[PDB]
Each structure stands twice: as C-alpha cells, then as structure tokens.
Amino acid sequence: INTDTLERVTEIFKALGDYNRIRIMEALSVSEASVGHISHQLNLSQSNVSHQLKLLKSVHLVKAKRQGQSMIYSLDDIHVATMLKQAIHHANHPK
Amino acid sequence: INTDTLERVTEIFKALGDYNRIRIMEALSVSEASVGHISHQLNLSQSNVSHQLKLLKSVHLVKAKRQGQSMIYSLDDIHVATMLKQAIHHANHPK
Ligand SMILES: [Cl-]
Ligand SMILES: [Cl-]
Ligand SMILES: [Cl-]
Ligand SMILES: [Cl-]
Ligand SMILES: [Zn+2]
Ligand SMILES: [Zn+2]
C-alpha cells in the first residue's frame, strides 16, 4: 500500500513510542479533558503536557475543541480509540 | 493503568515506528508467510527480514509456527491485526 500512507502510519506509531504520551492517550481514552485536568491527573507540568498534545495533534491522534471557557482535547476518532485499546488488551494477556 | 503494562505498550509502538517493520506487518496482515516469501514480496534481504521479525516477535507482534517444511510467521493475534488495520484506516481518511 501507498508510501505516503505507510509513512503516515510510521509517524503515528513513532509518536506513540513514548511513555508519557501513552499516559496522556490512555487518560484521554477514559475522558476528554483540558490540559490542566490532564497535567493534574498525571502529575506532569502543563508545559510538558501541552507540548506532547501538539505533537500528538500533529499526527492526528488527538484533536482540540473549544467547549465553554475550556479547550478540550480528545482522542481524534474511533480508529485511535480502538488502536490504543487493542494495544493495551494485547499487553495484558499471556503469550 | 500498570507501569509494567504501559511500558509493554510503549515497546510495542516503539517497535512499530519503522518503515520496513510496518511493510512486513502489513504483508503479514494479508497472509502469513515464510521469511523467504516476505523478502521476495518486499525486495529486502532475508537477513534483514529475519532480523526484523525476531525484533517483532520480541514484543509479541508476530509469531512463528512450523508448517510442513516451512517456518511460517503470522501476526501474533487478532489484537495486532485490528491495531494495524485501524492505524492504516486512520492514515487514509481526511481530518
Ligand atoms: Cl469523553
Ligand atoms: Cl493549537
Ligand atoms: Cl493467513
Ligand atoms: Cl527463533
Ligand atoms: Zn492479543
Ligand atoms: Zn480515523
């Protein structure tokens, strides 16, 4: 399949090969949330979390939507949710 | 969720952040196959393909099964298949 495609896939997985980015993604899989709420959940700086989310948004793994007086991040779409959830499933069984 | 877990997840995604490993995985998503058959499909050395498959087997993304006089590699299980297919889906639509 296409080279522009299999390159976008590698930048997606590349982006996911980082422990705190995975922690951010897995939190978002529970609930969309603001940068402040995420940094509180994970005990990371708002500066650090914001930087990571823009990296993730760069490869279309997260998106950001104004809601009221907050900027709310979410997993981009159902593909991202399913991909992450299957990965965690696989990491948690034997063989 | 657990640190042994979210570390196994990062090594999975880490392992997938490589163009030829993705090409190998995507070929296997079409059909299980021997090292020779893969290296022919992809025009890569058998030495290179074998090295990559042992890396992938290390993080339980592929498995290897004797069948007749051949050693056949496959995607480990349905979780891996779904994860890869969702990633490629996501890479191929807009927004
Ligand atoms: Cl939500
Ligand atoms: Cl922005
Ligand atoms: Cl098959
Ligand atoms: Cl072996
Ligand atoms: Zn599995
Ligand atoms: Zn998608």
DSSP A50-75: HHHHHHHHHTTSEEEEEETTEEEEEE
Indicate the resolution in Å.
Answer: 2.0
Q: How far is CA B26 from CA A17, B23, B30, B86, in A?
A: 19, 5, 7, 12
Cα(A27) to centroid of ligand 1, in Å?
10
Give me B50's structure tokens: 């074998």
Structure-determination approach:
X-ray
What is the domain partition of chain B in residue ranges? Answer: 1-95
CA atoms within 13 A on the CB side of B37: 12
Radius of gyration of chain A (CA): 14
Nearest by CB: B10 against A7, A22, A60:
A22
Calpha distance B35→B41 (Å, rounded): 10
Q: Do the annotations mark residue A37 as ligand-binding? A: no
A1-95 CATH pick, 3.40.190.10, 1.10.10.10, 1.20.1250.20, 1.20.1050.90: 1.10.10.10
